[PDB]
Amino acid sequence: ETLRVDPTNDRLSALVEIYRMMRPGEPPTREAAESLFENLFFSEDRYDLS
């Protein structure tokens, strides 16, 4: 029932929808939207579970 409310359908369209929430007002690109999702939880330097 959550997949009905999802406006995205693929991966690159979904990475834009995180950019429009995290950095709103700035138009997103391909390589700028890919590096933002990686830098949230999947980088050693900007995430630590300790």
Partner: peptide
């Protein structure tokens, strides 16, 4: 054609209020 991509953004913005975003745009 890099100005029609702003009209794809400007009517659909997340209402930015930071002037550094508006200048770098």
């Amino acid at each position: 054609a890099a100005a029609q991509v702003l009209s794809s953004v400007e009517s659909e913005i997340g209402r930015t209020t930071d002037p550094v975003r508006m200048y770098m745009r």
